[PDB]
Design a protein around this ligand. Structure first.
Ligand SMILES: CC(=O)c1ccc(O)cc1
Lengths: 237, 300
């Protein structure tokens, strides 16, 4: 069934599963035409396919050429997402294929179900959680590889850097969710928090800064604070 | 015109013949139904007074044999049987007509309702959906499940309707996933019409039979099948023009005949609102849309 607060720990058991977020697949800039009408221009996008347990991120870059001469792009985007997730599963060895795929938006259920008919034993699930996976393009290195792409491309990351050496995946996934929530609510202030201190750097092979355990406590504290600074500024509280 | 005699009527029962019905009291002198129109299938059906649970009945065609009804006090129901002795049957019926113990199939001469509800329904096709090959007639009741229902449990007592499933490999060509899901023309025209049914007449026959079982017996799996066969056509962008016009006529008479107080259970809101207002054929069912809007505007 649906993934919610009640069954949150299922995320970190030993059954392989993937989240699929399609928010950033079809990305446009709306603008005015010379005639004073409105038009869109697509920019490169990505499918965000992530394992909660290991941090392995399969970032399929969606190049704007895939939209050329197509109609109903927002609908096509869901079917393109489902086609690429199915292709990814088929490319994995059997023992690496997921037992479940959790989609962050319910409109992906039927497209993914139809593309996965060949895999009757892979459960396709929605979620009641409102995850901030859309903010993946606020991670500078992910945004850079997507915008630089000149052709379709898959790029593999570990979204948890080396955190699993020191913390469980429950805390790793929970830490990723809190950082992404902050970047979605106020990107500028979130990024100020993560980089304010010139002495904490991002390793070439990492996505986030190299915080100590104590520094992560502090960093998580300003993010928890920032999500309240916004929630007050938003609702006046 | 043909006759289905009844041995007797030992329990109180509402008896139906096609869209007609009448109440028979415990041990009332009822000995059957005469003047049944030749050329159509028919259904005789039963609801006992004491237990309105289990509507049941028999599909039959008087061209295929001499059939009668006899109550079985062990199994507790009215059973159809075939009489193989022709001169016995005629002598039985003739005696019952002389004593005027039979109701007359009460068809108005202007009235084409039954023809229009059974236009494509053949006994030979009924007997393949309802498998009991030692009889020429077919028993159906409220509780019988369909093959598709039994996949999601007694096979001999099943309705073997053609399985339709929009999220299935049969419905979806590899590499045409989006195309085939959003436009079911492939599945309708190649898989089902050319492949399985062979022609639109057999398709419409099964659709009509499913509706009649839903209406007369409250058979839930028959209702699912009727709606599935409507939806498959309406969700196809490419349907022969003769099929669309015939479909409009078929549905019109089904909606016209449906008891007004059974719509809440027998009509699927999603299917009809999609079929009439969102689908490829939203504009191809003028007669059905007009009667649905004037008779069941709440559902919509
Ligand atoms: C995401 C988050 O802030 C969070 C916090 C505490 C938990 O036990 C689980 C998740």
């Amino acid at each position: 069934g649906a993934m919610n607060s009640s069954n949150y720990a299922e995320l970190f058991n030993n059954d392989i599963k993937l989240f699929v977020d399609d928010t950033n697949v079809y990305r446009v800039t709306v603008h005015k035409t010379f005639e004073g009408n409105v038009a869109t221009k697509a920019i490169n996008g990505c499918i965000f396919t992530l394992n909660p347990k290991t941090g392995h991120l399969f970032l399929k870059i969606i190049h704007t050429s895939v939209w050329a001469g197509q109609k109903r792009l927002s609908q096509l985007a869901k079917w393109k997402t489902a086609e690429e997730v199915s292709a990814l599963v088929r490319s994995l060895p059997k023992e690496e294929q997921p037992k479940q795929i959790i989609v962050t938006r319910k409109a992906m259920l039927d497209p993914l179900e139809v593309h996965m008919l060949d895999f009757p034993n892979i459960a396709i699930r929605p979620t009641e959680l409102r995850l901030p996976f859309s903010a993946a393009m606020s991670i500078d290195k992910l945004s850079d590889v997507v915008m630089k792409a000149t052709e379709p491309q898959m790029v593999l990351f570990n979204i948890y850097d080396d955190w699993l050496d020191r913390i469980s995946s429950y805390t790793a996934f929970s830490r990723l969710t809190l950082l992404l929530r902050a970047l979605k609510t106020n990107e500028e202030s979130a990024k100020m928090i993560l980089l304010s201190d010139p002495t904490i750097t991002i390793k070439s092979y990492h996505l986030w800064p190299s915080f100590t355990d104590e520094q992560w406590i502090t960093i998580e504290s300003q993010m928890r604070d920032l999500i309240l600074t916004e929630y007050g500024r938003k609702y006046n509280v | 015109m043909n006759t289905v005699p009844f041995t007797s009527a030992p329990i109180e029962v509402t008896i139906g013949i096609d869209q007609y019905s009448f109440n028979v009291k415990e041990n009332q002198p009822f000995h059957g139904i005469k003047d049944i129109p030749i050329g159509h299938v028919h259904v005789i059906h039963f609801q006992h007074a004491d237990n309105s649970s289990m509507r049941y009945g028999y599909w039959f065609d008087c061209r295929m044999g001499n059939f009668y009804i006899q109550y079985d006090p062990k199994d507790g129901l009215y059973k159809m049987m075939e009489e193989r002795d022709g001169a016995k049957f005629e002598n039985i019926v003739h005696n019952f007509k002389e004593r005027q113990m039979m109701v007359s199939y009460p068809k108005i001469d202007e009235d084409d309702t039954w023809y229009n509800l059974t236009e494509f329904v053949q006994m030979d096709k009924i007997r393949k959906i309802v498998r009991k090959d030692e009889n020429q007639f077919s028993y159906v009741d409220s509780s019988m499940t369909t093959v598709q229902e039994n996949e999601l449990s007694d096979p001999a007592h099943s309705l073997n309707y053609t399985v339709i499933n929009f999220k299935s490999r049969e419905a979806i060509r590899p590499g045409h996933e989006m195309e085939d899901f959003l436009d079911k023309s492939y599945y309708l025209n190649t898989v089902m019409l050319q492949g399985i049914f062979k022609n639109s007449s057999n398709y419409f026959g099964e659709l009509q039979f499913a509706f009649l079982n839903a209406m007369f017996f409250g058979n839930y799996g028959s209702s699912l099948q009727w709606h599935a066969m409507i939806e498959l056509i309406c969700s196809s962008a490419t349907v022969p023009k003769h099929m669309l016009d015939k479909l409009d006529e078929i549905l019109y008479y089904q909606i016209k005949t449906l008891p007004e107080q059974y719509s809440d259970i027998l009509l699927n809101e999603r299917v009809w609102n999609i079929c009439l207002y969102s689908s490829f054929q939203k504009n191809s069912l003028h007669n059905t849309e007009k009667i649905m809007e004037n008779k069941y505007p709440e559902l919509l």
